[PDB]
Amino acid sequence: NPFRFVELVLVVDKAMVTKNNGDLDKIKTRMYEIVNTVNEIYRYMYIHVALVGLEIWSNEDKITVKPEAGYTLNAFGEWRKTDLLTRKKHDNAQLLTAIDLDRVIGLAYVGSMCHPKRSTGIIQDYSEINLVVAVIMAHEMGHNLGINHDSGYCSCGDYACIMRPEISPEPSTFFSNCSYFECWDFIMNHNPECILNEPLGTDIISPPVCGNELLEVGEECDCGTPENCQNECCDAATCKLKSGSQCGHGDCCEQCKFSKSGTECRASMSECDPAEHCTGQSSECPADVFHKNGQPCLDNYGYCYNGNCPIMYHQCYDLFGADVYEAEDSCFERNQKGNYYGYCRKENGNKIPCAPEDVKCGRLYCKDNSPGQNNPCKMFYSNEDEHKGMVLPGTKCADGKVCSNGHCVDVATAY
């Protein structure tokens, strides 16, 4: 599957509810319209956009929406990370506000897709023309997808491109060649892991549309307009199966037919993640199944965590290469300092030192015996991302103990 998927959640501030005289149906119908155009705008980029959530703050805003863009994007991002994402599985979120932002009409982080807090942007309800707001949105999500503003030798035709630093009064639905390459550049170097999965039809709240290249409720298949459709098993115009086709979508559908029962359709990540198989009568691969966390794995050197068996040895290896292993216990005592690298967790942007007992769950230390030198307590630190180098959650920190939220606790009570 060449296509990536952005499971989007939109949020409407109270300023907009009031501006629309409380007509929630009107607001909703309008969001469906806008997102539909965004999806069309993103075909070129081999990216699909599906609205999987819509929250209207008709009672009161859950953050203070100020005309100061930066403040508002940051708060929305925090709220999204500590609230929205906590209870709603989605990849990106945008806030629409009738409040007139200062210097701009939209603002978003760059190259932050899937980031719990930064995978967001704010959009001003600049115009009643859905194509216009659809442009702002595609633009802010563009930045999220690692795209920067066009400049110099960038082109999308004799039209006004989407990523220009200013919106044109004659907005087009085109991304520049520069936007394209920079986007997939981000998609390669950085891994937007959350835009790989295809959203289920029941996950989309917009009204199903046959032809948007998205399989929704009431459709057996969907390959877009009859002109772009390259799916032999589907009748584009009706989204119905045609000919000797027993299916036209799914990881268990090969050449318009169910794959033989027992066919693996999702490989196993580890002894903690049992692979999945096709039934022979279904086209969809069953949902990913992981063994229960806490299950002993890798010959007792670890315990299962979300389908993987994280252990300090592999972590040292991935961080420093060969000839590196778990440092002696004394090394980890550095974690009691609460200094720039030695700590267990963060709370309100504060580095919390490890309690004497949670020392194996903070910054990771490895004894380095790779050629050339000696180093008993090697540790990795980069203010580019302070979390890198930290012991992973679910890692065995002692006999019968695992790391959970920066604490070394009993495996038995950990899950």
Ligand SMILES: *[C@@H]1O[C@H](CO)[C@@H](O[C@@H]2O[C@H](CO)[C@@H](O[C@H]3O[C@H](CO)[C@@H](O)[C@H](O)[C@@H]3O)[C@H](O)[C@H]2NC(C)=O)[C@H](O)[C@H]1NC(C)=O
């Ligand atoms: C995005 O597409 C651009 C082409 O559409 C591409 O290259 C730029 O394209 C123009 C013509 O479209 C080239 O030609 C112009 O400049 C030369 C040299 O002065 C003249 O001889 C021509 O008559 C014309 O005026 C540009 O030279 C060329 N610029 C670059 C960057 O090489 C962009 O590069 C494409 N973007 C990317 C990076 O993929």
Ligand SMILES: CNC(=O)[C@H](Cc1c[nH]c2ccccc12)NC(=O)[C@@H](CC(=O)NO)CC(C)C
């Ligand atoms: C009507 N107002 C606009 O078009 C201003 C113009 C502008 C603000 N700061 C600038 C710096 C350099 C060049 C132009 C501007 N730009 C915007 O609203 C753009 C802001 C942006 O980069 N959002 O991600 C989003 C917009 C493209 C939809």
Ligand SMILES: [Ca+2]
């Ligand atoms: Ca997703």
Ligand SMILES: [Ca+2]
């Ligand atoms: Ca559809």
Ligand SMILES: [Ca+2]
């Ligand atoms: Ca599985």
Ligand SMILES: [Zn+2]
């Ligand atoms: Zn921009």
